[PDB]
Amino acid sequence: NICEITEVDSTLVERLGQRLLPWMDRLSQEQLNPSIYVGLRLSSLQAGAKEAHYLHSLKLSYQQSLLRPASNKDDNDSEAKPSMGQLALYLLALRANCEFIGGRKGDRLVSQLKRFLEDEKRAIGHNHQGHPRTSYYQYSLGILALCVHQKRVHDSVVGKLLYAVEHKPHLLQDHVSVDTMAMAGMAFSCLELSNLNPKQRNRINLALKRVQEKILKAQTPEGYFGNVYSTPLALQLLMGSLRPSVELGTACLKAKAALQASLQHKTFQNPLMISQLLPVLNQKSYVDLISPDCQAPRALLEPALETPPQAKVPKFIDVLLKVSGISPSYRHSVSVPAGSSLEDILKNAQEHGRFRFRTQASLSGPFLTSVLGRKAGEREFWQVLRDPDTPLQQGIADYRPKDGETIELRLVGW
Ligand code: B12
Ligand SMILES: [Cl-]
Ligand SMILES: [Cl-]
Ligand SMILES: [Cl-]
Protein backbone atom coordinates (compact mmCIF):
# COMPACT_ATOMS: atom_id res chain seq x y z
CA ASN A 1 0.00 0.00 0.00
CA ILE A 2 1.24 3.44 -1.09
CA CYS A 3 -0.03 5.33 1.97
CA GLU A 4 1.97 3.09 4.28
CA ILE A 5 5.22 4.11 5.90
CA THR A 6 7.29 1.31 4.50
CA GLU A 7 10.73 2.31 5.68
CA VAL A 8 11.62 3.88 9.00
CA ASP A 9 14.90 4.02 10.82
CA SER A 10 14.41 1.64 13.74
CA THR A 11 16.60 3.81 15.99
CA LEU A 12 14.22 6.73 15.36
CA VAL A 13 11.29 4.49 16.24
CA GLU A 14 13.15 3.28 19.31
CA ARG A 15 13.79 6.84 20.49
CA LEU A 16 10.11 7.62 20.09
CA GLY A 17 9.21 4.53 22.11
CA GLN A 18 11.72 5.49 24.76
CA ARG A 19 9.69 8.67 25.26
CA LEU A 20 6.59 6.55 26.16
CA LEU A 21 8.45 4.16 28.42
CA PRO A 22 8.51 6.33 31.62
CA TRP A 23 4.74 6.86 31.29
CA MET A 24 4.46 3.13 31.91
CA ASP A 25 5.31 3.79 35.57
CA ARG A 26 2.77 6.57 35.76
CA LEU A 27 -0.28 4.70 36.89
CA SER A 28 -2.15 7.40 38.78
CA GLN A 29 -5.68 8.08 37.61
CA GLU A 30 -4.70 11.32 35.89
CA GLN A 31 -1.57 9.91 34.30
CA LEU A 32 -3.11 6.67 33.07
CA ASN A 33 -3.44 6.96 29.33
CA PRO A 34 -5.26 4.43 27.15
CA SER A 35 -3.85 6.12 24.02
CA ILE A 36 -0.26 5.37 25.01
CA TYR A 37 -1.14 1.71 25.58
CA VAL A 38 -2.88 1.44 22.21
CA GLY A 39 0.06 3.13 20.47
CA LEU A 40 2.60 0.75 21.94
CA ARG A 41 0.49 -2.38 21.23
CA LEU A 42 0.00 -1.37 17.64
CA SER A 43 3.67 -0.45 17.36
CA SER A 44 6.80 -2.48 16.56
CA LEU A 45 7.83 -1.78 20.15
CA GLN A 46 7.07 -3.12 23.57
CA ALA A 47 7.40 -1.32 26.86
CA GLY A 48 7.65 -4.68 28.72
CA ALA A 49 4.78 -6.33 30.60
CA LYS A 50 5.04 -2.97 32.16
CA GLU A 51 2.24 -3.12 29.55
CA ALA A 52 0.18 -5.75 31.37
CA HIS A 53 0.26 -3.83 34.68
CA TYR A 54 -0.71 -0.79 32.68
CA LEU A 55 -3.78 -2.33 31.08
CA HIS A 56 -4.69 -3.87 34.43
CA SER A 57 -4.39 -0.40 36.00
CA LEU A 58 -6.52 1.02 33.20
CA LYS A 59 -9.14 -1.70 33.86
CA LEU A 60 -9.24 -1.10 37.60
CA SER A 61 -9.32 2.66 37.32
CA TYR A 62 -11.82 3.01 34.46
CA GLN A 63 -14.09 0.51 36.12
CA GLN A 64 -13.86 1.83 39.68
CA SER A 65 -14.26 5.44 38.54
CA LEU A 66 -16.99 4.95 35.98
CA LEU A 67 -19.15 2.40 37.81
CA ARG A 68 -19.32 4.13 41.27
CA PRO A 69 -22.45 3.47 43.49
CA ALA A 70 -25.95 4.89 42.76
CA SER A 71 -25.62 7.79 45.28
CA ASN A 72 -22.20 8.74 46.72
CA LYS A 73 -21.77 9.56 50.43
CA ASP A 74 -22.15 13.39 50.56
CA ASP A 75 -20.18 14.96 47.61
CA ASN A 76 -21.65 14.80 44.02
CA ASP A 77 -18.02 14.81 42.80
CA SER A 78 -15.24 12.97 44.71
CA GLU A 79 -12.28 11.93 42.49
CA ALA A 80 -13.39 13.18 39.02
CA LYS A 81 -13.44 10.18 36.65
CA PRO A 82 -12.38 9.58 32.99
CA SER A 83 -14.41 11.27 30.26
CA MET A 84 -16.41 9.35 27.71
CA GLY A 85 -13.97 9.98 24.86
CA GLN A 86 -11.36 8.57 27.22
CA LEU A 87 -13.67 5.65 27.83
CA ALA A 88 -13.66 5.30 24.03
CA LEU A 89 -9.86 5.12 24.06
CA TYR A 90 -10.03 2.65 26.93
CA LEU A 91 -12.17 0.42 24.67
CA LEU A 92 -9.46 0.70 22.01
CA ALA A 93 -7.01 -0.37 24.72
CA LEU A 94 -8.93 -3.56 25.43
CA ARG A 95 -9.04 -4.45 21.73
CA ALA A 96 -5.31 -3.81 21.63
CA ASN A 97 -5.04 -6.63 24.15
CA CYS A 98 -7.28 -8.73 21.88
CA GLU A 99 -10.13 -8.53 24.36
CA PHE A 100 -13.73 -7.73 23.71
CA ILE A 101 -15.47 -5.73 26.37
CA GLY A 102 -17.75 -7.94 28.46
CA GLY A 103 -19.46 -9.02 31.62
CA ARG A 104 -21.81 -6.76 33.49
CA LYS A 105 -19.16 -4.08 34.08
CA GLY A 106 -18.45 -4.03 30.36
CA ASP A 107 -22.17 -3.74 29.54
CA ARG A 108 -22.43 -0.69 31.78
CA LEU A 109 -19.35 0.91 30.14
CA VAL A 110 -20.77 0.31 26.66
CA SER A 111 -24.12 1.88 27.80
CA GLN A 112 -22.22 4.83 29.24
CA LEU A 113 -20.58 5.26 25.88
CA LYS A 114 -23.88 4.94 24.01
CA ARG A 115 -25.57 7.44 26.29
CA PHE A 116 -22.69 9.82 25.57
CA LEU A 117 -23.25 9.52 21.83
CA GLU A 118 -27.02 9.84 22.27
CA ASP A 119 -26.43 12.95 24.37
CA GLU A 120 -24.11 14.39 21.74
CA LYS A 121 -26.67 13.50 19.03
CA ARG A 122 -29.26 15.52 21.03
CA ALA A 123 -26.79 18.44 21.61
CA ILE A 124 -25.97 18.57 17.91
CA GLY A 125 -29.69 18.63 17.24
CA HIS A 126 -32.44 18.23 14.69
CA ASN A 127 -30.59 19.53 11.64
CA HIS A 128 -27.26 20.27 13.21
CA GLN A 129 -27.56 23.83 14.44
CA GLY A 130 -26.05 23.20 17.86
CA HIS A 131 -22.65 21.74 18.73
CA PRO A 132 -21.38 18.55 20.39
CA ARG A 133 -20.66 19.22 24.03
CA THR A 134 -17.25 17.68 23.34
CA SER A 135 -16.31 17.45 19.64
CA TYR A 136 -16.91 15.39 16.50
CA TYR A 137 -13.51 13.91 17.13
CA GLN A 138 -14.79 12.35 20.35
CA TYR A 139 -18.09 11.56 18.62
CA SER A 140 -16.21 9.64 15.91
CA LEU A 141 -13.85 8.10 18.42
CA GLY A 142 -16.90 6.82 20.37
CA ILE A 143 -18.49 5.17 17.34
CA LEU A 144 -15.11 3.75 16.30
CA ALA A 145 -14.53 2.38 19.83
CA LEU A 146 -17.92 0.60 19.93
CA CYS A 147 -17.48 -0.64 16.41
CA VAL A 148 -14.13 -2.32 17.05
CA HIS A 149 -15.89 -4.23 19.85
CA GLN A 150 -18.69 -5.14 17.41
CA LYS A 151 -21.15 -2.96 19.34
CA ARG A 152 -23.75 -1.35 17.16
CA VAL A 153 -24.72 2.29 17.42
CA HIS A 154 -28.15 3.57 16.53
CA ASP A 155 -28.43 4.66 12.94
CA SER A 156 -29.50 8.13 14.22
CA VAL A 157 -26.20 8.40 16.12
CA VAL A 158 -24.15 7.52 12.99
CA GLY A 159 -26.40 9.74 10.88
CA LYS A 160 -25.19 12.78 12.83
CA LEU A 161 -21.57 12.12 11.99
CA LEU A 162 -22.36 11.28 8.32
CA TYR A 163 -24.42 14.44 7.84
CA ALA A 164 -21.68 16.59 9.43
CA VAL A 165 -19.13 15.05 7.01
CA GLU A 166 -21.55 15.21 4.07
CA HIS A 167 -23.12 18.61 4.37
CA LYS A 168 -22.10 22.10 3.15
CA PRO A 169 -18.87 24.24 3.33
CA HIS A 170 -17.32 22.05 6.02
CA LEU A 171 -18.39 22.94 9.56
CA LEU A 172 -15.17 21.87 11.34
CA GLN A 173 -12.62 24.39 12.59
CA ASP A 174 -9.12 24.29 11.08
CA HIS A 175 -7.55 23.10 14.36
CA VAL A 176 -9.75 20.01 14.50
CA SER A 177 -10.15 19.54 10.73
CA VAL A 178 -7.89 16.74 9.47
CA ASP A 179 -7.71 14.97 12.82
CA THR A 180 -11.51 14.89 13.04
CA MET A 181 -11.85 13.72 9.42
CA ALA A 182 -9.29 10.99 10.01
CA MET A 183 -11.12 9.80 13.14
CA ALA A 184 -14.54 9.99 11.46
CA GLY A 185 -13.05 8.15 8.48
CA MET A 186 -11.82 5.46 10.80
CA ALA A 187 -15.29 5.21 12.42
CA PHE A 188 -16.92 4.92 8.94
CA SER A 189 -14.34 2.46 7.70
CA CYS A 190 -14.95 0.25 10.75
CA LEU A 191 -18.72 0.50 10.20
CA GLU A 192 -18.26 -0.66 6.62
CA LEU A 193 -15.85 -3.51 7.39
CA SER A 194 -18.17 -4.61 10.19
CA ASN A 195 -21.44 -4.04 8.33
CA LEU A 196 -22.90 -2.67 11.61
CA ASN A 197 -25.31 -0.20 9.99
CA PRO A 198 -26.13 -1.85 6.61
CA LYS A 199 -29.14 0.50 6.27
CA GLN A 200 -26.68 3.36 5.53
CA ARG A 201 -23.97 1.32 3.76
CA ASN A 202 -23.80 3.52 0.67
CA ARG A 203 -23.98 6.72 2.69
CA ILE A 204 -21.01 5.55 4.79
CA ASN A 205 -19.04 4.72 1.64
CA LEU A 206 -19.68 8.19 0.21
CA ALA A 207 -18.76 9.73 3.59
CA LEU A 208 -15.44 7.88 3.25
CA LYS A 209 -14.57 9.31 -0.18
CA ARG A 210 -15.60 12.72 1.16
CA VAL A 211 -13.33 12.30 4.19
CA GLN A 212 -10.49 11.24 1.89
CA GLU A 213 -11.10 14.27 -0.37
CA LYS A 214 -11.09 16.80 2.47
CA ILE A 215 -7.88 15.38 3.93
CA LEU A 216 -6.06 15.61 0.57
CA LYS A 217 -7.50 19.10 0.13
CA ALA A 218 -5.98 19.99 3.51
CA GLN A 219 -2.43 19.06 2.42
CA THR A 220 0.09 21.83 3.08
CA PRO A 221 3.00 22.84 0.74
CA GLU A 222 5.25 21.03 3.25
CA GLY A 223 3.41 17.73 2.60
CA TYR A 224 1.53 17.56 5.94
CA PHE A 225 -2.16 16.79 6.15
CA GLY A 226 -3.33 19.80 8.18
CA ASN A 227 -0.06 19.94 10.10
CA VAL A 228 2.69 17.53 11.15
CA TYR A 229 0.62 16.40 14.14
CA SER A 230 -2.55 15.51 12.12
CA THR A 231 -0.50 13.63 9.58
CA PRO A 232 -0.22 10.33 11.53
CA LEU A 233 -4.01 10.07 12.04
CA ALA A 234 -4.49 11.12 8.40
CA LEU A 235 -2.13 8.32 7.33
CA GLN A 236 -3.85 5.87 9.69
CA LEU A 237 -7.01 6.56 7.70
CA LEU A 238 -5.33 6.81 4.30
CA MET A 239 -3.43 3.49 4.56
CA GLY A 240 -6.91 1.92 4.70
CA SER A 241 -7.13 2.56 0.91
CA LEU A 242 -10.30 1.39 -0.92
CA ARG A 243 -10.03 4.50 -3.13
CA PRO A 244 -6.53 4.10 -4.60
CA SER A 245 -5.67 7.05 -6.84
CA VAL A 246 -2.81 8.99 -8.41
CA GLU A 247 -3.66 12.08 -6.39
CA LEU A 248 -3.87 9.90 -3.25
CA GLY A 249 -0.59 8.15 -4.07
CA THR A 250 1.22 11.44 -4.60
CA ALA A 251 -0.37 12.97 -1.51
CA CYS A 252 0.78 10.01 0.61
CA LEU A 253 4.32 10.11 -0.75
CA LYS A 254 4.55 13.83 0.07
CA ALA A 255 2.90 13.25 3.50
CA LYS A 256 5.29 10.39 4.33
CA ALA A 257 8.47 12.21 3.36
CA ALA A 258 7.40 15.29 5.34
CA LEU A 259 6.69 13.04 8.35
CA GLN A 260 10.06 11.22 8.15
CA ALA A 261 11.77 14.59 7.81
CA SER A 262 10.14 15.80 11.06
CA LEU A 263 11.29 12.59 12.79
CA GLN A 264 14.91 13.72 12.28
CA HIS A 265 14.18 16.89 14.26
CA LYS A 266 12.60 15.60 17.48
CA THR A 267 9.21 16.99 16.43
CA PHE A 268 7.26 14.35 18.36
CA GLN A 269 7.74 14.85 22.05
CA ASN A 270 4.16 14.58 23.22
CA PRO A 271 3.31 11.11 24.50
CA LEU A 272 -0.22 11.09 22.95
CA MET A 273 1.22 12.21 19.61
CA ILE A 274 3.84 9.50 19.65
CA SER A 275 1.04 7.08 20.55
CA GLN A 276 -0.69 8.18 17.30
CA LEU A 277 2.50 8.01 15.23
CA LEU A 278 3.96 4.66 16.31
CA PRO A 279 1.05 2.65 14.91
CA VAL A 280 1.52 4.31 11.53
CA LEU A 281 5.23 3.52 11.62
CA ASN A 282 4.18 -0.09 12.08
CA GLN A 283 1.65 0.13 9.22
CA LYS A 284 -1.23 -0.08 11.60
CA SER A 285 -4.19 2.06 12.50
CA TYR A 286 -7.00 2.09 15.02
CA VAL A 287 -9.05 0.27 12.36
CA ASP A 288 -6.80 -2.78 12.84
CA LEU A 289 -8.39 -3.08 16.27
CA ILE A 290 -11.27 -4.83 14.52
CA SER A 291 -9.03 -7.89 14.34
CA PRO A 292 -5.90 -7.16 16.37
CA ASP A 293 -2.92 -9.48 16.18
CA CYS A 294 -1.59 -9.98 19.69
CA GLN A 295 0.84 -12.70 18.61
CA ALA A 296 3.08 -10.48 16.53
CA PRO A 297 6.39 -9.94 18.35
CA ARG A 298 7.65 -6.42 19.02
CA ALA A 299 11.07 -5.23 20.04
CA LEU A 300 11.57 -4.76 23.74
CA LEU A 301 12.28 -1.19 24.73
CA GLU A 302 14.80 -0.94 27.54
CA PRO A 303 15.21 2.10 29.81
CA ALA A 304 17.36 4.84 28.19
CA LEU A 305 19.25 5.18 31.49
CA GLU A 306 21.62 8.08 30.50
CA THR A 307 20.18 11.69 30.80
CA PRO A 308 23.39 13.52 29.57
CA PRO A 309 24.84 15.67 32.46
CA GLN A 310 26.55 18.70 30.82
CA ALA A 311 27.65 20.74 33.90
CA LYS A 312 27.66 23.51 31.27
CA VAL A 313 26.00 26.83 31.92
CA PRO A 314 22.91 26.79 29.70
CA LYS A 315 21.79 29.48 27.35
CA PHE A 316 18.93 31.49 28.75
CA ILE A 317 16.08 32.76 26.67
CA ASP A 318 14.19 35.93 27.40
CA VAL A 319 10.54 35.45 26.69
CA LEU A 320 7.60 37.75 26.90
CA LEU A 321 4.41 36.28 28.24
CA LYS A 322 1.17 38.05 27.39
CA VAL A 323 -2.48 37.39 28.11
CA SER A 324 -5.27 38.68 25.94
CA GLY A 325 -9.01 38.12 25.43
CA ILE A 326 -9.68 39.17 29.00
CA SER A 327 -9.65 42.41 30.92
CA PRO A 328 -7.23 43.33 32.12
CA SER A 329 -4.55 42.05 29.75
CA TYR A 330 -1.29 41.06 31.47
CA ARG A 331 2.36 40.79 30.47
CA HIS A 332 5.28 39.13 32.11
CA SER A 333 8.99 39.10 31.30
CA VAL A 334 10.82 35.88 32.02
CA SER A 335 14.35 34.65 31.47
CA VAL A 336 14.73 30.91 31.73
CA PRO A 337 17.12 28.20 30.48
CA ALA A 338 16.77 27.37 26.79
CA GLY A 339 14.61 24.21 26.51
CA SER A 340 12.24 25.32 29.29
CA SER A 341 8.67 24.43 28.43
CA LEU A 342 5.95 27.06 28.17
CA GLU A 343 4.58 25.36 31.28
CA ASP A 344 7.84 25.90 33.17
CA ILE A 345 7.53 29.56 32.22
CA LEU A 346 3.90 29.74 33.40
CA LYS A 347 4.83 28.14 36.71
CA ASN A 348 7.75 30.57 36.95
CA ALA A 349 5.54 33.65 36.32
CA GLN A 350 3.13 32.27 38.91
CA GLU A 351 5.94 31.68 41.42
CA HIS A 352 7.75 34.96 40.81
CA GLY A 353 5.02 37.33 39.80
CA ARG A 354 1.40 38.29 39.56
CA PHE A 355 0.58 35.47 37.25
CA ARG A 356 -1.72 32.58 37.80
CA PHE A 357 -3.15 29.78 35.72
CA ARG A 358 -4.75 26.41 36.02
CA THR A 359 -4.46 23.35 33.85
CA GLN A 360 -6.32 20.12 33.94
CA ALA A 361 -5.25 16.59 33.08
CA SER A 362 -5.87 15.28 29.56
CA LEU A 363 -4.43 12.45 27.56
CA SER A 364 -2.25 15.03 25.79
CA GLY A 365 -0.99 16.35 29.08
CA PRO A 366 -1.75 19.57 30.99
CA PHE A 367 -4.48 21.46 29.20
CA LEU A 368 -4.55 25.17 30.05
CA THR A 369 -8.08 25.87 31.24
CA SER A 370 -7.80 29.06 33.30
CA VAL A 371 -5.50 32.09 33.17
CA LEU A 372 -5.47 34.80 35.80
CA GLY A 373 -8.69 33.50 37.32
CA ARG A 374 -10.53 33.45 33.99
CA LYS A 375 -11.61 29.94 33.24
CA ALA A 376 -12.44 29.16 29.63
CA GLY A 377 -16.19 28.58 29.27
CA GLU A 378 -18.44 26.61 26.95
CA ARG A 379 -16.95 27.08 23.50
CA GLU A 380 -13.90 28.93 24.69
CA PHE A 381 -10.35 27.94 25.05
CA TRP A 382 -7.10 29.42 26.04
CA GLN A 383 -5.30 29.56 22.75
CA VAL A 384 -1.58 29.60 22.83
CA LEU A 385 0.24 31.62 20.16
CA ARG A 386 3.64 32.87 19.28
CA ASP A 387 3.45 36.56 18.44
CA PRO A 388 2.40 37.47 15.85
CA ASP A 389 -0.86 35.44 15.61
CA THR A 390 0.73 31.99 15.07
CA PRO A 391 -1.14 29.31 17.08
CA LEU A 392 1.29 26.88 18.63
CA GLN A 393 1.13 23.25 17.55
CA GLN A 394 2.28 22.02 20.92
CA GLY A 395 0.65 22.54 24.32
CA ILE A 396 2.27 24.13 27.34
CA ALA A 397 4.32 21.14 28.53
CA ASP A 398 5.71 20.39 25.09
CA TYR A 399 6.26 23.80 23.56
CA ARG A 400 9.79 24.98 24.14
CA PRO A 401 9.96 28.68 23.29
CA LYS A 402 12.81 30.26 21.41
CA ASP A 403 14.80 33.27 22.50
CA GLY A 404 12.96 36.55 22.00
CA GLU A 405 9.52 35.00 21.57
CA THR A 406 6.36 36.58 22.78
CA ILE A 407 3.94 33.85 23.79
CA GLU A 408 0.32 34.83 23.92
CA LEU A 409 -2.37 33.17 25.99
CA ARG A 410 -5.51 34.28 24.20
CA LEU A 411 -9.03 33.49 25.38
CA VAL A 412 -10.88 32.62 22.17
CA GLY A 413 -14.27 31.28 21.13
CA TRP A 414 -14.45 28.36 18.69
C1 B12 B 1 -10.81 18.73 20.04
C2 B12 B 1 -9.43 19.33 20.11
C3 B12 B 1 -9.24 20.53 20.73
C4 B12 B 1 -10.31 21.30 21.45
C5 B12 B 1 -10.61 20.64 22.76
C6 B12 B 1 -11.86 21.12 23.48
C7 B12 B 1 -13.07 20.34 23.09
N1 B12 B 1 -14.02 20.97 22.49
O1 B12 B 1 -13.15 19.15 23.35
C8 B12 B 1 -9.71 22.72 21.49
C9 B12 B 1 -10.13 23.50 20.26
C10 B12 B 1 -10.06 23.53 22.73
C11 B12 B 1 -8.23 22.41 21.36
C12 B12 B 1 -7.22 23.22 21.80
C13 B12 B 1 -5.91 23.07 21.59
N2 B12 B 1 -5.33 22.12 20.87
CO1 B12 B 1 -6.32 20.60 20.34
N3 B12 B 1 -7.12 19.10 19.57
C14 B12 B 1 -8.33 18.64 19.54
C15 B12 B 1 -8.39 17.28 18.83
C16 B12 B 1 -9.02 17.52 17.47
C17 B12 B 1 -9.09 16.15 19.61
C18 B12 B 1 -8.75 15.95 21.08
C19 B12 B 1 -9.64 14.95 21.75
O2 B12 B 1 -10.82 15.19 22.00
N4 B12 B 1 -9.07 13.78 22.08
C20 B12 B 1 -9.83 12.66 22.58
C21 B12 B 1 -10.07 12.71 24.05
C22 B12 B 1 -10.60 11.41 24.60
O3 B12 B 1 -8.79 13.01 24.63
P1 B12 B 1 -8.55 13.97 25.81
O4 B12 B 1 -7.10 13.98 26.09
O5 B12 B 1 -9.45 13.65 26.92
O6 B12 B 1 -8.95 15.33 25.12
C23 B12 B 1 -8.65 16.57 25.72
C24 B12 B 1 -7.39 17.24 25.25
O7 B12 B 1 -7.20 16.84 23.89
C25 B12 B 1 -7.71 18.74 25.34
N5 B12 B 1 -6.86 19.28 24.30
C26 B12 B 1 -7.18 19.58 23.04
N6 B12 B 1 -6.16 19.91 22.31
C27 B12 B 1 -5.06 19.80 23.18
C28 B12 B 1 -3.73 20.02 23.00
C29 B12 B 1 -2.86 19.79 24.05
C30 B12 B 1 -1.41 19.99 23.85
C31 B12 B 1 -3.34 19.37 25.30
C32 B12 B 1 -2.37 19.15 26.41
C33 B12 B 1 -4.70 19.18 25.49
C34 B12 B 1 -5.51 19.40 24.42
O8 B12 B 1 -9.06 18.75 24.96
C35 B12 B 1 -9.71 17.51 25.26
C36 B12 B 1 -10.66 17.73 26.34
O9 B12 B 1 -11.85 17.85 25.65
C37 B12 B 1 -6.92 16.87 18.77
C38 B12 B 1 -6.58 15.93 17.64
C39 B12 B 1 -5.67 14.77 17.96
N7 B12 B 1 -4.85 14.38 17.01
O10 B12 B 1 -5.69 14.25 19.07
C40 B12 B 1 -6.22 18.22 18.81
C41 B12 B 1 -4.81 18.38 19.33
C42 B12 B 1 -4.64 17.49 20.56
N8 B12 B 1 -4.74 19.82 19.72
C43 B12 B 1 -3.56 20.31 19.50
C44 B12 B 1 -3.18 21.64 19.85
C45 B12 B 1 -1.82 22.07 19.40
C46 B12 B 1 -4.01 22.42 20.58
C47 B12 B 1 -3.67 23.76 21.24
C48 B12 B 1 -2.31 23.87 21.93
C49 B12 B 1 -3.79 24.83 20.13
C50 B12 B 1 -3.37 26.23 20.51
N9 B12 B 1 -2.36 26.77 19.88
O11 B12 B 1 -3.95 26.82 21.42
C51 B12 B 1 -4.89 23.99 22.16
C52 B12 B 1 -4.74 23.67 23.63
C53 B12 B 1 -4.17 24.78 24.46
C54 B12 B 1 -4.53 24.67 25.88
N10 B12 B 1 -5.50 25.45 26.30
O12 B12 B 1 -3.91 23.88 26.63
C55 B12 B 1 -2.64 19.34 18.82
C56 B12 B 1 -1.48 18.89 19.76
C57 B12 B 1 -0.21 18.51 19.08
C58 B12 B 1 0.91 18.15 20.01
N11 B12 B 1 2.13 18.14 19.54
O13 B12 B 1 0.67 17.87 21.20
C59 B12 B 1 -3.69 18.32 18.27
C60 B12 B 1 -3.19 16.92 17.99
C61 B12 B 1 -4.17 18.88 16.91
C62 B12 B 1 -3.08 19.03 15.89
N12 B12 B 1 -2.97 18.14 14.94
O14 B12 B 1 -2.28 19.90 15.97
N13 B12 B 1 -8.03 21.23 20.82
CL1 LIG C 1 -23.82 2.74 34.03
CL1 LIG D 1 5.07 17.14 20.47
CL1 LIG E 1 -6.22 30.86 36.97
Side-chain angles (χ1 to χ4, degrees), residues 66-67 108-109 111-112 115:
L66 300 178
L67 306 173
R108 294 191 49 197
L109 293 180
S111 302
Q112 282 181 37
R115 274 152 189 153

Side-chain angles (χ1 to χ4, degrees), residues 203-317:
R203 216 187 155 196
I204 288 159
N205 202 275
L206 276 46
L208 267 168
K209 161 98 290 298
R210 253 289 231 203
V211 154
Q212 182 171 129
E213 265 157 32
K214 296 200 185 164
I215 290 166
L216 306 196
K217 201 215 152 283
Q219 194 153 32
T220 78
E222 306 94 43
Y224 308 129
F225 294 119
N227 72 20
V228 65
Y229 302 112
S230 314
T231 307
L233 275 185
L235 283 170
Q236 283 196 36
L237 187 266
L238 292 181
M239 81 172 82
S241 318
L242 294 198
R243 227 89 166 180
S245 87
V246 213
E247 19 291 282
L248 177 60
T250 306
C252 279
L253 295 179
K254 261 187 88 36
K256 290 182 311 194
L259 192 54
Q260 311 257 40
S262 88
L263 281 11
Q264 307 304 129
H265 305 126
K266 291 199 296 180
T267 311
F268 283 80
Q269 302 278 302
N270 178 257
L272 191 130
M273 280 297 95
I274 294 164
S275 86
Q276 292 195 346
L277 174 67
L278 288 183
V280 150
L281 297 190
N282 193 44
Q283 307 99 56
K284 275 178 169 174
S285 86
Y286 296 160
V287 177
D288 283 297
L289 294 164
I290 295 173
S291 45
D293 181 9
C294 299
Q295 318 282 291
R298 297 171 290 143
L300 192 72
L301 281 164
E302 299 166 326
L305 234 99
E306 55 205 17
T307 41
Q310 330 77 39
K312 274 248 85 210
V313 178
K315 289 205 172 96
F316 273 32
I317 58 177

